[PDB]
């Protein structure tokens, strides 16, 4: 009866929720209530108790909880205060079940950039000013690890920028051994990298400079060491190095990944600069003379002779039960990712699944099942299944335990397990109401419904939604998967304006099956648009030779595949050939600005939102990974005929809007500042918007200024 | 197993001490020993370490090139000496047995006595 | 006929030439013609030789041009690179003439700062890295002065930032005797000043950081010395420093000017911080120490009770032939500037003029003449009239020289002289076709007409142009005088759209007879639109009521004078009521964007560019010269209730537009990126453009974008 | 007029020296002196200065605390004192008659004579 608002799209009127049990045992979860009290339920029992009451969270403003696993400490973190996208500082309390009071003797100091317990007891790590300490007792004095941390300069326990964003996508590098026996951390060296600084305006009378650590392609990378330190007399020999692999360590290299697999077993993956040679290395323990040795037996190479190892991260292994074994998800013969087996090497690798179709993650390995996902299922790319696997039975089995539950209402899930797989939990994001469901471990039958989400249903009976399909093209030989959303009362005798959103990046993949109410819905159901999206070489989970396609290439393919995909849309008929539009975002804004300006009269005006200028401005890892070095003698010659500036003079005949924000840390303002003295010197007309102090996601009243500021340029665009 | 350690006691800085540690029980000749100090208040910290034959003997950064150690079978003593001594020495030293003869070892936490006390100040 | 285009006025088309005369002698001067030979003319003779040849000046691609007052070398400046407003570096060869070869033995330092002669002889007095350099001759090794200059932080010989924008309005602060016997320099310290730092990008991987020493309001200001070294024999006792007057010497206070009177006697005047008293100081020479000494009897105060001492600057007097009295303007009893002649105390001035009219400036003192500029001619404060007084005659006399020799067509003249005032030069600016000539000296018999500008003439005949008229207003006692520009062919029984261009500056005057074909011609000639300057209160050249009642309040009346003057314009009758807009630069993006958002709903759209938003982000002199200090005790209230962010709620119904630079120096991006935060706060939609590595002029064709987008944004607007 | 100095010469690091200077023809006891040296290839630069009465005497920067003056308007005769050397006074120094004795005054280039060289140096 009514249609959707821009008003229900900023504030967040139809917004789902979902259910994440805070698992603590293979029988018990943590949950927070809506009245601030921390609850656990067994499921053996269904017993509901209460073990911290709202009253001593608001004792201290306290707005995050952790509890150790022994179930006689609780710390409390309030304070909390946002670094970067994954790293923030927060001030921590600890209080006492048993006595029902805090913890008067030795206070935690303050702020502490990152804290955890140990998986057994409650031996207490944390990081304070870039240095590690360790608490045997909360009552106790802490011992203090390093010495040399420094800020900015060297990085203990934590990592630097590069590392957070490209590498780990964690604020944390330092793990306690599976039984609490040792400790592991990385020291990150970034005295010889350069830095880039902007301006941070604030609220006083003179603004500040920031000052980061920041490799762009082609430069100083940082140096990474890795210690263990054992916990109980950490005074005997100190902090002990594993040694390097050989081959790795000729050049500059990379730290991918360490995984703990025994209390005297360690996994460490490297990865070189040249970033198609991978390197996973078993470094074990010696009890003689207290050292780790990393045996060249033990070392597997992992080679990628057509493009970069893995995809946008190189895979993290999963060993088995018997710690002997492992299983890792890498591309086979045809050219497809899949699972394989390595027990002895490399080359003897055993390929359980096998198949067009591809696999994503790894969930868990047990002694029994192994859990994954994948879009096998009617051959539909955009789906995510989750798959079940028996190792070691006298008849094999394999089983789609998420294929058939909702059908109609969802077709994406993730999962989420517990200790010793007994309970999980499955979450389904769309193409229907998201709903979140716990199931067993050994039959898997749905035993309780953690959310349902009928609010939302109640309150979406009154609005019209517009229409969603996906579909696929050929051209020639390649095949286009666009998703296509069409207003309430489409009739195919009539003529409407069309909007395609690109984003195009590397292993990315722009058309699934998920549930959101946003912008363009609004759009669609509002203004009566036709709105697209469109996926085809260089994304990921469609096949080895579509990915790899944009290799030293990047800005060429997509390019083709959106202009070939406006030219079929056109060809059916409902079109209008004078209203097409474009827009993107963090590497859209770079294809939209190279589609804009391809001279062949096709859009009538684009928007660009933090984009990437030229390819030398980036971060060394991501660039790097699939455009090699800026050398005279590797592929200096494409980073020069790869920039937006190079079009300037095809910007003429067409309406652009360029939009970034002053003080982003990861794609910087110097490329829109090219961008626009490029255009200033071609004598071409176009518009711009800037957001002050503010950063790559634009957080807060900026969204809504951006939204409506781009539905304002798209309503006189179309007019 | 029994071990018994001497020597040592107050000294100026600058100066050089010597100890002895003497042990039965079990048999000589076929193990390897180390130094470990402890410091009041702070934890255990290994020192040196020498080899069953008497060939090979390990130190650490802390006591580089200063320190010595020996041994005779003849007698089931262990010798450690110290030269040029710092303010930060202060402890009670301990002689420990490790359980692999085969080549050098560094006992983890093997057995202990009394220990021997020095000081150093001025 | 045809109408202006825009590209006449992007790239110059109708753009007049004035002729400056170099004058080395009396009777000879210096020119450059259209062939890069520098040809020196003769007047009593009339022959004309060529002085230096092109071939000479191509061979070391030279620029500019200097030569001695001994007519034996000649000093050519190449490799000119701008540094701010006014400073600039270049490389600097010596020619000799006689000999007709290059002068060698002993070659400059590169680059040079500032390079300059003696009035007498051949002697080079030239600055390189921050410190003064002295040659006897240009074949002799220099003689070093000074030793303590540092890169940004200790100035020798050249002003800093703000001395050179705020203070001075030069490049240098070094001073030879009139006879050539001593040197004069200044020593600036900013050691304990904070800096502001922004990002430059450039042609470059990594952007780099500008730190520029910028003191703000109420921050610590330089501290400067004056030294006085004498040159034949210049290690005798070095460099000797003149004694700082005991009341001003008790604070803070800034240095205004010095001024060389004879070759034992200088002339330093003194400002306190607190800018409402000046005082001048006269400091004589003592040959039995070879001291300076200023006594307290040649000590002169100037109070102003209502309001700061003079106008933008400080008046710099100038003294007789007697060198014992000296003329100075400054306000008289009722409120006027005026001419006061001062010899032994100041309670003893003398009125030489009087009325209700205004003295603007000084030209010249001779034994019986006295040059100045008023507007006393019908009453009208936007011409400029150079007048003549006899000094020391039997019967008083005071000729216009320039009132009737064009009446229709110059109404604004500016004078250049020569040695004892044989012969000088008219400029006429407008408002017809500017003019260039050379006068007697004595009979004031026009001799030679230096520039008619025909080729202007000639091309301006199929051209129609706007009418423009300059009328007054009177309302509540207030008279403002506004300039007026109609279209052709203009009939008042029609309505037409109207445009305010406002600056509002104090101590400024926008409504002067000034020839001039702009942004604003292009608008009335081809689109038919009626553009309107006013000027009010808180401007010059009127009286002092009118200067001083914007003391210590600015950003009150301006507004109200605006909006009152467009009320009285739609209460013409020929103006429409629906369609008005206004626009300012630098200062009136201040007023522009106060009026704006007044809540009158008066105006339509409005344009800012590179506007201050708050007081507290602009320089120490200019701010607290009409504000005062930003303390609890002084004038902290009207500091934070006159900020254009405390109006974000009042831009709602309105349009606007705002432009800034990025690499500003003299206005910060910070004043708008404050301004867009606070917008966004309010959530208020606005339309941006900056411009990347430009300073506050915005050269090049970042102009020609400019207007182009503000013709645009202008068109849409009153569509 | 006739001015004639003498005294000084070679003299090693750290050493101490006296000069001296006699004039004639005008008339003393009436007139301030004072002393100024010319290093080889610089300018003039002025040491210091004393008054007719030989009361208040006046000392460069450059020499304040090592350098005494003295006269004798009995044999006409001006001495300089020079203590506590460094390698920076290779010089030839002059003694220079001002033009004003009512008080101590500088004279800027008045009677000159011949001068006297001193050199220090290891
Ligand atoms: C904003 O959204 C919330 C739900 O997140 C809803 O309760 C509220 O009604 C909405 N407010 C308005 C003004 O629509
Ligand atoms: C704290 O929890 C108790 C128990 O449910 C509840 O009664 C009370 O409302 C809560 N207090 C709040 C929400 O302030
Ligand atoms: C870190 O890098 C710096 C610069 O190369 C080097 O001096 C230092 O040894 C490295 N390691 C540490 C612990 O600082
Ligand atoms: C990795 O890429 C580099 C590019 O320089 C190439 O030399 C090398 O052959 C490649 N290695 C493999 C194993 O493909
Ligand atoms: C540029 O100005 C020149 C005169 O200075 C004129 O000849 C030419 O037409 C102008 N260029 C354009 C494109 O109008
Ligand atoms: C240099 O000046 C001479 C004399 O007028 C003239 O002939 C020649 O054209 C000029 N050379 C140029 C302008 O390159
Ligand atoms: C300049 O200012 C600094 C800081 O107060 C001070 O140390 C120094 O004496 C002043 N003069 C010179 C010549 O540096
Ligand atoms: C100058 O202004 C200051 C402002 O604090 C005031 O105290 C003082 O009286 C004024 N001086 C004169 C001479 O008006």
Same mark, same amino acid.
């Given at each position: 009866?009514?249609?959707?608002?821009?008003?229900?799209?900023?504030?967040?009127?139809?917004?789902?929720?979902?259910?994440?049990?805070?698992?603590?045992?293979?029988?018990?979860?943590?949950?927070?209530?809506?009245?601030?009290?921390?609850?656990?339920?067994?499921?053996?029992?269904?017993?509901?108790?209460?073990?911290?009451?709202?009253?001593?969270?608001?004792?201290?403003?306290?707005?995050?909880?952790?509890?150790?696993?022994?179930?006689?400490?609780?710390?409390?973190?309030?304070?909390?205060?946002?670094?970067?996208?994954?790293?923030?500082?927060?001030?921590?309390?600890?209080?006492?079940?048993?006595?029902?009071?805090?913890?008067?003797?030795?206070?935690?100091?303050?702020?502490?950039?990152?804290?955890?317990?140990?998986?057994?007891?409650?031996?207490?790590?944390?990081?304070?000013?870039?240095?590690?300490?360790?608490?045997?007792?909360?009552?106790?004095?802490?011992?203090?690890?390093?010495?040399?941390?420094?800020?900015?300069?060297?990085?203990?326990?934590?990592?630097?920028?590069?590392?957070?964003?490209?590498?780990?996508?964690?604020?944390?590098?330092?793990?306690?051994?599976?039984?609490?026996?040792?400790?592991?951390?990385?020291?990150?060296?970034?005295?010889?990298?350069?830095?880039?600084?902007?301006?941070?305006?604030?609220?006083?009378? @003179?603004?500040?400079?920031?000052?980061?650590?920041?490799?762009?392609?082609?430069?100083?990378?940082?140096?990474?060491?890795?210690?263990?330190?054992?916990?109980? @007399?950490?005074?005997?020999?100190?902090?002990?190095?594993?040694?390097?692999?050989?081959?790795?360590?000729?050049?500059?290299?990379?730290?991918?990944?360490?995984?703990?697999?025994?209390?005297?077993?360690?996994?460490?993956?490297?990865?070189?600069?040249?970033?198609?040679?991978?390197?996973?290395?078993?470094?074990?323990?010696?009890?003689?003379?207290?050292?780790?040795?990393?045996?060249?037996?033990?070392?597997?190479?992992?080679?990628?002779?057509?493009?970069?190892?893995?995809?946008?991260?190189?895979?993290?292994?999963?060993?088995? @039960?018997?710690?002997?074994?492992?299983?890792?998800?890498?591309?086979?013969?045809?050219?497809?990712?899949?699972?394989?087996?390595?027990?002895?090497?490399?080359?003897?690798?055993?390929?359980?699944?096998?198949?067009?179709?591809?696999?994503?993650?790894?969930?868990?390995?047990?002694?029994?099942?192994?859990?994954?996902?994948?879009?096998?299922?009617?051959?539909?790319?955009?789906?995510?299944?989750?798959?079940?696997?028996?190792?070691?039975?006298?008849?094999?089995?394999?089983?789609?335990?998420?294929?058939?539950?909702?059908?109609?209402?969802?077709?994406?899930?993730?999962?989420?397990?517990?200790?010793?797989?007994?309970?999980?939990?499955?979450?389904?994001?769309?193409?229907?109401?998201?709903?979140?469901?716990?199931?067993?471990?050994?039959?898997?039958?749905?035993?309780?419904?953690?959310?349902?989400?009928?609010?939302?249903?109640?309150?979406?009976?009154?609005?019209?939604?517009?229409?969603?399909?996906?579909?696929?093209?050929?051209?020639?030989?390649?095949?286009?998967?666009?998703?296509?959303?069409?207003?309430?009362?489409?009739?195919?005798?009539?003529?409407?304006?069309?909007?395609?959103?690109?984003?195009?990046?590397?292993?990315?993949?722009?058309?699934?099956?998920?549930?959101?109410?946003?912008?363009?819905?609004?759009?669609?159901?509002?203004?009566?648009?036709?709105?697209?999206?469109?996926?085809?070489?260089?994304?990921?989970?469609?096949?080895?030779?579509?990915?790899?396609?944009?290799?030293?290439?990047?800005?060429?393919?997509?390019?083709?595949?959106?202009?070939?995909?406006?030219?079929?849309?056109?060809?059916?008929?409902?079109?209008?050939?004078?209203?097409?539009?474009?827009?993107?975002?963090?590497?859209?804004?770079?294809?939209?600005?190279?589609?804009?300006?391809?001279?062949?009269?096709?859009?009538?005006?684009?928007?660009?939102?933090?984009?990437?200028?030229?390819?030398?401005?980036?971060?060394?890892?991501?660039?790097?990974?699939?455009?090699?070095?800026?050398?005279?003698?590797?592929?200096?010659?494409?980073?020069?005929?790869?920039?937006?500036?190079?079009?300037?003079?095809?910007?003429?005949?067409?309406?652009?809007?360029?939009?970034?924000?002053?003080?982003?840390?990861?794609?910087?303002?110097?490329?829109?500042?090219?961008?626009?003295?490029?255009?200033?010197?071609?004598?071409?007309?176009?518009?711009?918007?800037?957001?002050?102090?503010?950063?790559?996601?634009?957080?807060?009243?900026?969204?809504?200024?951006?939204?409506?500021?781009?539905?304002?340029?798209?309503?006189?665009?179309?007019? | 197993?029994?071990?018994?350690?001497?020597?040592?006691?107050?000294?100026?800085?600058?100066?050089?001490?010597?100890?002895?540690?003497?042990?039965?029980?079990?048999?000589?000749?076929?193990?390897?020993?180390?130094?470990?100090?402890?410091?009041?208040?702070?934890?255990?910290?290994?020192?040196?370490?020498?080899?069953?034959?008497?060939?090979?003997?390990?130190?650490?950064?802390?006591?580089?090139?200063?320190?010595?150690?020996?041994?005779?079978?003849?007698?089931?003593?262990?010798?450690?000496?110290?030269?040029?001594?710092?303010?930060?020495?202060?402890?009670?030293?301990?002689?420990?047995?490790?359980?692999?003869?085969?080549?050098?070892?560094?006992?983890?936490?093997?057995?202990?006595?009394?220990?021997?006390?020095?000081?150093?100040?001025?």
């Amino acid at each position: 009866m009514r249609a959707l608002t821009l008003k229900d799209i900023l504030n967040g009127t139809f917004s789902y929720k979902t259910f994440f049990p805070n698992w603590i045992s293979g029988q018990e979860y943590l949950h927070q209530s809506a009245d601030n009290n921390i609850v656990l339920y067994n499921i053996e029992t269904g017993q509901s108790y209460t073990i911290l009451s709202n009253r001593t969270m608001k004792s201290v403003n306290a707005s995050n909880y952790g509890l150790s696993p022994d179930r006689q400490f609780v710390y409390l973190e309030s304070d909390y205060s946002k670094l970067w996208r994954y790293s923030y500082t927060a001030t921590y309390y600890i209080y006492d079940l048993s006595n029902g009071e805090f913890v008067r003797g030795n206070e935690l100091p303050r702020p502490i950039q990152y804290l955890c317990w140990s998986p057994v007891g409650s031996k207490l790590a944390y990081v304070y000013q870039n240095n590690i300490y360790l608490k045997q007792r909360p009552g106790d004095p802490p011992f203090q690890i390093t010495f040399n941390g420094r800020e900015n300069k060297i990085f203990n326990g934590i990592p630097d920028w590069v590392y957070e964003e490209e590498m780990l996508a964690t604020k944390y590098a330092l793990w306690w051994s599976p039984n609490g026996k040792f400790l592991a951390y990385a020291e990150f060296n970034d005295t010889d990298i350069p830095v880039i600084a902007y301006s941070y305006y604030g609220d006083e009378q @003179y603004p500040r400079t920031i000052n980061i650590p920041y490799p762009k392609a082609g430069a100083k990378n940082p140096v990474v060491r890795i210690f263990i330190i054992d916990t109980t @007399y950490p005074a005997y020999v100190g902090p002990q190095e594993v040694p390097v692999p050989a081959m790795i360590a000729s050049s500059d290299y990379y730290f991918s990944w360490l995984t703990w697999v025994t209390d005297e077993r360690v996994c460490l993956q490297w990865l070189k600069r040249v970033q198609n040679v991978s390197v996973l290395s078993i470094c074990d323990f010696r009890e003689d003379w207290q050292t780790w040795d990393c045996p060249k037996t033990q070392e597997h190479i992992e080679e990628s002779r057509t493009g970069w190892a893995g995809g946008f991260f190189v895979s993290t292994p999963v060993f088995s @039960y018997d710690a002997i074994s492992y299983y890792k998800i890498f591309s086979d013969k045809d050219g497809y990712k899949h699972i394989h087996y390595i027990k002895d090497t490399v080359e003897n690798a055993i390929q359980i699944t096998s198949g067009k179709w591809e696999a994503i993650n790894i969930f868990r390995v047990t002694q029994d099942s192994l859990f994954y996902s994948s879009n096998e299922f009617e051959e539909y790319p955009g789906r995510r299944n989750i798959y079940r696997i028996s190792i070691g039975s006298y008849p094999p089995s394999k089983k789609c335990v998420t294929c058939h539950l909702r059908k109609e209402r969802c077709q994406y899930y993730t999962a989420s397990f517990s200790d010793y797989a007994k309970y999980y939990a499955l979450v389904c994001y769309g193409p229907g109401i998201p709903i979140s469901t716990l199931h067993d471990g050994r039959t898997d039958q749905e035993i309780k419904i953690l959310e349902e989400n009928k609010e939302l249903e109640n309150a979406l009976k009154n609005i019209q939604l517009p229409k969603e399909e996906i579909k696929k093209l050929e051209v020639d030989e390649i095949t286009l998967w666009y998703k296509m959303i069409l207003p309430p009362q489409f009739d195919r005798s009539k003529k409407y304006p069309l909007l395609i959103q690109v984003y195009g990046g590397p292993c990315s993949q722009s058309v699934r099956s998920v549930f959101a109410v946003n912008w363009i819905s609004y759009l669609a159901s509002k203004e009566g648009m036709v709105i697209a999206l469109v996926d085809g070489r260089g994304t990921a989970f469609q096949g080895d030779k579509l990915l790899y396609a944009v290799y030293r290439k990047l800005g060429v393919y997509e390019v083709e595949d959106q202009i070939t995909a406006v030219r079929k849309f056109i060809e059916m008929g409902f079109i209008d050939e004078k209203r097409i539009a474009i827009w993107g975002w963090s590497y859209g804004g770079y294809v939209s600005s190279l589609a804009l300006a391809s001279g062949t009269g096709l859009f009538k005006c684009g928007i660009a939102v933090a984009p990437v200028s030229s390819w030398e401005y980036y971060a060394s890892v991501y660039t790097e990974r699939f455009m090699g070095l800026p050398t005279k003698d590797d592929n200096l010659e494409h980073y020069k005929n790869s920039t937006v500036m190079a079009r300037a003079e095809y910007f003429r005949n067409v309406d652009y809007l360029l939009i970034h924000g002053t003080a982003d840390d990861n794609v910087h303002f110097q490329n829109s500042a090219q961008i626009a003295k490029a255009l200033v010197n071609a004598q071409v007309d176009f518009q711009a918007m800037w957001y002050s102090d503010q950063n790559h996601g634009l957080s807060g009243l900026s969204t809504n200024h951006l939204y409506t500021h781009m539905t304002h340029f798209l309503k006189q665009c179309f007019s | 197993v029994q071990l018994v350690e001497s020597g040592g006691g107050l000294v100026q800085p600058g100066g050089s001490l010597r100890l002895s540690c003497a042990a039965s029980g079990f048999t000589f000749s076929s193990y390897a020993m180390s130094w470990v100090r402890q410091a009041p208040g702070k934890g255990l910290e290994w020192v040196s370490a020498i080899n069953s034959g008497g060939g090979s003997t390990s130190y650490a950064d802390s006591v580089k090139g200063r320190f010595t150690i020996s041994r005779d079978n003849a007698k089931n003593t262990l010798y450690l000496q110290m030269n040029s001594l710092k303010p930060e020495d202060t402890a009670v030293y301990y002689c420990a047995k490790a359980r692999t003869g085969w080549s050098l070892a560094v006992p983890s936490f093997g057995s202990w006595g009394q220990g021997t006390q020095v000081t150093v100040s001025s």
